[PDB]
Design an enzyme around this catalytic site. Structure first.
Site, PDB file in Angstrom:
ATOM      1  N   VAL A 221       0.343   7.203  -2.514  1.00 57.20           N
ATOM      2  CA  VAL A 221       0.171   8.663  -2.323  1.00 57.20           C
ATOM      3  C   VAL A 221       0.815   9.138  -1.022  1.00 57.20           C
ATOM      4  O   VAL A 221       1.026   8.351  -0.092  1.00 57.20           O
ATOM      5  CB  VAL A 221      -1.319   9.132  -2.383  1.00 57.20           C
ATOM      6  CG1 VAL A 221      -1.956   8.734  -3.706  1.00 57.20           C
ATOM      7  CG2 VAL A 221      -2.108   8.525  -1.229  1.00 57.20           C
ATOM      8  N   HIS A 222       1.151  10.422  -0.959  1.00 54.60           N
ATOM      9  CA  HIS A 222       1.536  10.983   0.334  1.00 54.60           C
ATOM     10  C   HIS A 222       0.350  10.800   1.291  1.00 54.60           C
ATOM     11  O   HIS A 222      -0.811  10.957   0.866  1.00 54.60           O
ATOM     12  CB  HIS A 222       1.908  12.454   0.237  1.00 54.60           C
ATOM     13  CG  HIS A 222       2.604  12.950   1.466  1.00 54.60           C
ATOM     14  ND1 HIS A 222       1.923  13.377   2.586  1.00 54.60           N
ATOM     15  CD2 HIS A 222       3.921  13.000   1.783  1.00 54.60           C
ATOM     16  CE1 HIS A 222       2.789  13.703   3.528  1.00 54.60           C
ATOM     17  NE2 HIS A 222       4.010  13.482   3.067  1.00 54.60           N
ATOM     18  N   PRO A 223       0.617  10.434   2.562  1.00 56.23           N
ATOM     19  CA  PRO A 223      -0.482  10.257   3.524  1.00 56.23           C
ATOM     20  C   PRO A 223      -1.442  11.458   3.556  1.00 56.23           C
ATOM     21  O   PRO A 223      -2.659  11.284   3.741  1.00 56.23           O
ATOM     22  CB  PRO A 223       0.250  10.115   4.858  1.00 56.23           C
ATOM     23  CG  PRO A 223       1.581   9.530   4.495  1.00 56.23           C
ATOM     24  CD  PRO A 223       1.931  10.097   3.160  1.00 56.23           C
TER      25      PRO A 223
END
Ligand SMILES: [Ca+2]
Length: 330
Positions: A221-223
């Protein structure tokens, strides 16, 4: 020192929603930084909420979190009643097959990505954003899970299963390893450009042939979306074998019978006019006049919910009303 109140999006919210959209990750394309698209999104929600005794699956429900004093919008989130109702919902299916080598006696199990639209008909959580100061707060819990409480109150409007596609990984120059390895080879835009384009708007791929960095990025996932993922993990969602066709972000899934804020939610009468305990997510259970808040309550099943006059005003409830609630928990 202001109450936050979740409610359906209104047409006049557009400029505030655009601010949220501009601050959200570009890979959250369900919240595009585009006035036209956002206007259409709000109109669709208004139509969905307004048709109180008819629905057919075309619906979408867009919620905003509002500072009750200032009027500032500080978050938003949405539900799509039926993924792929109007245009196909595309995913890569990560599937395996076995190539038998007769002369070696090896039966080699190999992963491939196959373009598909398998997730059609599932209800879909989208458009989640909260401002930075609300990350890891009860208000992020409200912004996400208020949708689940809504689904609990109106089960027929939605599928018996829910999916969510979490924005995938891109670095701090906006490079997506997965996009670079896959999609970019078919249409040479950078990731940010491709997602901006996606927002403003067939044979299997061997996983072993993709670069290591792209393989590593699959299902990541995106951070900035870890918060979103973690809220849903606690709700009982699990990763499914589908990933985003642009960035390879993971898809989560759960049956409504196994989603905490649906299955464990309760409808309870209220008593208004007057303690500390623990935070609960509380909704008025309504459609067009839907409202949800977080309240610190000393409450347990079997008694009415004690609401302050301020809380009852925020919720739009009065004497003899019921609310739906669930502990924020952990
Ligand atoms: Ca995505």
């Amino acid at each position: 020192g202001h109450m936050l109140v979740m409610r359906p999006a209104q047409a006049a919210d557009l400029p505030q929603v655009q601010r949220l959209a501009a601050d959200s990750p570009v890979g959250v394309t369900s919240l595009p930084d585009d006035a036209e698209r956002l206007r259409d999104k709000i109109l669709a929600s208004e139509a969905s909420f307004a048709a109180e005794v008819s629905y057919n699956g075309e619906e979408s429900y867009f919620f905003v979190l509002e500072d009750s004093a200032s009027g500032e919008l500080v978050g938003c989130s949405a539900i799509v009643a039926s993924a792929g109702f109007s245009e196909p919902f595309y995913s890569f299916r990560n599937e395996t097959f076995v190539h038998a080598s007769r002369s070696l006696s090896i039966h080699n199990k190999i992963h491939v990505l196959s373009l598909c639209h398998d997730l059609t008909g599932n209800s879909l959580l989208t458009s989640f954003y909260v401002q930075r100061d609300l990350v890891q707060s009860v208000y992020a819990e409200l912004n996400s899970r208020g949708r689940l409480l809504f689904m609990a109150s109106h089960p027929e409007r939605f599928a018996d299963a829910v999916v969510v596609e979490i924005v995938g990984y891109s670095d701090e120059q906006g490079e997506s390893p997965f996009w670079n390895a896959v999609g970019r080879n078919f249409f040479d835009l950078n990731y940010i450009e491709a997602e901006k384009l996606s927002g403003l708007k067939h044979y299997p791929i061997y996983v072993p042939l993709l670069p290591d960095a792209a393989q590593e990025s699959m299902g990541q996932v995106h951070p900035r979306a870890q918060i979103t993922f973690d809220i849903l993990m606690r709700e009982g969602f699990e990763t499914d074998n589908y990933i985003d066709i642009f960035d390879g972000g993971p898809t989560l899934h759960a049956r409504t019978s196994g989603i905490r804020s649906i299955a464990q939610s309760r409808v309870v009468p209220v008593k208004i006019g007057e303690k500390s305990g623990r935070p609960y997510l509380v909704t008025n259970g309504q459609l067009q006049d839907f409202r949800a808040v977080v309240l610190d309550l000393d409450w347990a099943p079997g008694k009415p919910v004690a609401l302050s006059v301020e809380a009852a005003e925020a919720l739009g409830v009065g004497e003899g009303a019921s609310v739906r609630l669930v502990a924020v928990g952990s």
